[PDB]
Design a protein around this ligand. Structure first.
Ligand SMILES: O=C(Nc1cc(F)c(F)cc1C(=O)O)c1ccc(-n2ccnc2)nn1
Ligand SMILES: O=C(Nc1cc(F)c(F)cc1C(=O)O)c1ccc(-n2ccnc2)nn1
Lengths: 176, 184
């Protein structure tokens, strides 16, 4: 049940705040900042849900075919006593054969780091961590399916390694 | 178990990251004479834990005697696929009789908003009583986490309070000043 609460926490504390302005920020980037010949940034927030709960800080460290392109225009807002809290979301090019194949706003679901931290060493086994990660994912899918902030503007990317993270994301980008 | 998990998720997801550099950033802010002449910033992160789980976005809206002053210079770092994620931490003056009595880095514990959002509308008997119990468990777990955590080196003060029914009888600025004066 901890992961059910973490999924709610992620929606209430982050996704409900970030999803409503996302379309407008992507449109700003596409119309004002993006070089003439660069491909458009895709319209969705792509959230990585590694079922192993491995959340590295740097996506280019995780797969060099995920290349940092630029920041979205920043979203600021008062939040829980932070005046003008800053959200500096990252845009990535997904490379195939050294060339851009897709461009998107991509990040990991941060609460998966809690499940990982509490099970990295051996109570709370790897199998228990997998079960919590799946519960997180199922709970978050149910929340977003019902949430008025989720309007074809978010895509959950849940995966288990048996692998290219870039190819996993591209399969989701190309399903749209 | 949810409150226990939220306390861990708050330490792992934020306090672990923000606490190690915080005193260096405050020290830097206080070394600017024009800042120090206004008043020294207290050398701790003060975390508000309203046990009702009510977490308004703007502290001056909560209590006009909590006056926004300034921001620490941004801390950036790569986090969970966010390149150079930005932490803009707010500094407040705490007023007594219209005058500065203290200056601090102050914010609400964000996961208390989840406890609240999940029970605000409940028609269950004892939903408010159950929420208060969850909030206390959250605070207890977080106190126990930070007692043991190497990032917590007399640099964090949890401010847990249950507000009275009577809105006018409670002053959040006074609640923070009580803590700020002990930390001194
Ligand atoms: O997951 C986040 N937040 C939370 C998750 C919780 F479960 C919770 F209880 C509270 C929060 C919170 O932030 O208060 C989160 C994720 C990405 C970014 N972000 C993206 C660009 N810059 C910052 N910011 N926050
Ligand atoms: O509580 C926060 N975050 C989280 C809490 C979680 F429970 C979790 F699982 C993940 C996060 C997360 O951020 O990923 C949080 C609070 C303050 C600020 N902040 C202060 C200035 N600018 C930004 N940022 N984040």
């Amino acid at each position: 049940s901890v992961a059910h609460g973490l999924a709610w926490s992620y929606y209430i504390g982050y996704l409900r705040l970030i999803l409503p302005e996302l379309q407008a920020r992507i449109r700003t980037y596409n119309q004002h900042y993006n070089n003439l010949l660069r491909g458009a940034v895709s319209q969705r927030l792509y959230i990585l849900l590694p079922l192993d709960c491995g959340v590295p800080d740097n996506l280019s460290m995780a797969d060099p075919n995920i290349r940092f392109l630029d920041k979205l225009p920043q979203q600021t807002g008062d939040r829980a006593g932070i005046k003008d809290r800053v959200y500096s979301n990252s845009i990535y090019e997904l490379l195939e054969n050294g060339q851009r194949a897709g461009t998107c706003v991509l990040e990991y679901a941060t609460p998966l780091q809690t499940l990982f931290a509490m099970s990295q060493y051996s109570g709370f086994s790897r199998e228990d961590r997998l079960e919590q990660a799946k519960l997180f994912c199922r709970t978050l899918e149910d929340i977003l399916a019902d949430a008025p902030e989720s309007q074809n503007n978010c895509r959950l990317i849940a995966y288990q390694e048996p692998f290219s993270l870039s190819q996993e994301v591209l399969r989701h980008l190309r399903q749209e």
